[PDB]
């Protein structure tokens, strides 16, 4: 339901400097102002809407959505969005192999879940100091990164990615398993691995919130 | 490197008018004029091979145009060769 | 590099100014090049080598501003 006006205010049309553009992004580039590319919104809006529909359709059939964003500017934003829609997110460093090596990272998930339980019950009495502090740091790391996927359970039904270039590793694994990919592709990004291309700004808090809000609304709608 | 007046003159007697600078007869006459001019220069400075490469290049170019001519309008050729000081 | 000592100029600072003037003129480096004789071919390589080195400095003066170390 997002309108061209709101996207224009958020700076979605803004691309990167001409020094970094990828020529495969030419069809979605409207032009360059002051050596900065401008994304052609007249092509994004019809195509973005078609993606939003399919996401609603996937959410209608109990689909699982995995939001991927690692920029510290947008890390918390993605977290909040996923929490709202009871989805999953990875705000910390993407560990290689969540998707290709899922049957192994499950063990780390299992360790995380026991640590969440057995530390609240056990540490209080059996502190001893040293071991308690050690396991506490351990917990931090794991959750800080794997906290959003502890209860995910299995393979996702769709991927939502910010800055397809930065998270190229995540897209590769999703492509290997045939999981559909929805990525925000900037001018310096590679759209070859993306099944649903959304050309827009991936670096602005304003723009990223817009995108996350849009996607969050549609998925909740399908769920209901 | 030919002077402007010499180029303008040579065009007149070999071309229909002042703008027919491209006809084959004009090209041969222009080439022949420079071969004769560079001959006095090239008898001396015997080691000027770099300028000598240029002379052979116009000689080769003149050979193709004269051969091209003889193929068509044979007459024109004979008038040209008699008017110029070239054996062949 | 001709240096003239001015009034109320300490001798030590005049010598220090002399070190810079010779250094900026490259007198010591020049004499080193000309002490022995260099061969046309070799030198050319050294020059091109240093030139590639400076080109790499440029390509490292940028793009390197990314990634982490700790």
């Amino acid at each position: 339901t997002v309108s061209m006006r709101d996207m224009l205010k958020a700076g979605v049309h803004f691309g990167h400097q001409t020094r970094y553009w990828n020529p495969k992004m030419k069809p979605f580039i409207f032009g360059a102002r002051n050596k900065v590319h401008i994304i052609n919104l007249e092509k994004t809006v019809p195509m973005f809407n078609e993606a939003l529909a399919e996401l609603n359709k996937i959410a209608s059939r109990k689909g699982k959505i995995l939001f991927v964003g690692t920029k510290r500017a947008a890390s918390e934003a993605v977290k909040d969005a996923a929490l709202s829609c009871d989805q999953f997110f990875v705000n910390h460093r993407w560990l290689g192999g969540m998707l290709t090596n899922w049957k192994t990272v499950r063990q780390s998930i299992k360790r995380l879940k026991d640590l969440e339980t057995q530390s609240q019950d056990g540490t209080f009495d059996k502190l001893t100091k040293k071991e308690a502090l050690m396991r506490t740091r351990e917990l931090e790391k794991l959750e800080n990164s794997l906290g959003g996927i502890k209860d995910m359970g299995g393979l996702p039904d769709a991927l939502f990615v910010i800055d397809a270039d930065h998270e190229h590793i995540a897209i590769k694994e999703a492509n290997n398993l045939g999981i559909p990919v929805f990525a925000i592709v900037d001018t310096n990004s590679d759209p070859d691995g993306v099944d649903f291309v959304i050309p827009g700004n991936d670096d602005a808090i304003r723009a990223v919130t817009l995108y996350l809000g849009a996607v969050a609304a549609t998925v909740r709608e399908g769920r209901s | 490197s030919l002077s402007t007046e010499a180029t303008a003159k040579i065009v007149s007697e070999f071309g229909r008018d002042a703008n027919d600078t491209g006809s084959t007869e004009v090209q041969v006459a222009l080439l022949t004029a420079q071969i004769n001019h560079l001959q006095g220069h090239f008898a001396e400075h015997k080691k000027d091979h770099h300028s000598r490469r240029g002379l052979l290049r116009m000689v080769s170019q003149r050979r193709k145009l004269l051969d091209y001519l003889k193929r068509k309008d044979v007459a024109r050729y004979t008038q040209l060769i008699e008017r110029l000081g070239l054996r062949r | 590099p001709v240096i003239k000592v001015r009034e109320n100029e300490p001798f030590d600072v005049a010598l220090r100014r002399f070190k810079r003037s010779c250094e900026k003129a490259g007198v010591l480096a020049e004499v080193r090049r000309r002490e022995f004789y260099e061969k046309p071919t070799t030198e050319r390589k050294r020059a091109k080598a240093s030139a590639v080195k400076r080109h790499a400095k440029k390509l490292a003066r940028e793009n390197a501003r990314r990634t982490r170390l700790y």
Partner: protein
């Protein structure tokens, strides 16, 4: 909906910005080391707080404040924009000196030393030349007494190619 061409033509006119121009940023968040500012650009800028702080170092800016900061880039910083405010303050210093030149306004400084043809003077971090015999109306034989004191000055010439401000109290 309005055509993108017309919309972007609109957007740039309410913005009026360019690498050489000045921008009107909006303060988003105030952190210990940096301040988040939005100038309508493609990315928030984490501008260090000391740039916004006044000469005395007290926080004069609050969330939501409008700041006439200078533009540095748009995505040079790892794809992010950088903003400058000390340069805007430097511009403020230069323009008030220009007013002192034209409108005869007063700019205050300190005489730092004496040179062959006059005095070296300090104007908020700028070097100035004060002619020896034009310091004051009264022809005092020993003019050294005014060194090291805060004094008003009027700009006679401003050379950007040397950062040299020729000034006199006359």
């Amino acid at each position: 909906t309005e055509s993108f061409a017309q919309l972007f033509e609109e957007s740039l006119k309410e913005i009026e910005t360019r690498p050489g121009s000045i921008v009107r940023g909006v303060v988003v968040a105030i952190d210990k080391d940096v301040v988040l500012v939005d100038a309508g650009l493609k990315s928030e800028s984490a501008i260090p707080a000391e740039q916004f702080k006044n000469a005395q170092g007290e926080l004069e800016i609050q969330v939501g404040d409008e700041v006439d900061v200078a533009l540095d880039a748009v995505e040079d910083g790892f794809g992010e924009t950088l903003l400058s405010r000390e340069k805007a303050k430097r511009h403020e210093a230069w323009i008030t000196l220009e007013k002192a030149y034209e409108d005869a306004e007063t700019v205050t400084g300190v005489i730092n030393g004496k040179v062959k043809g006059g005095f070296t003077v300090e104007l908020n971090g700028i070097r100035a030349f004060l002619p020896g015999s034009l310091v004051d109306v009264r022809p005092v034989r020993d003019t050294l007494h005014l060194e090291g004191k805060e004094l008003e000055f009027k700009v006679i010439k401003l050379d950007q190619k040397r950062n040299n401000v020729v000034v006199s109290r006359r």
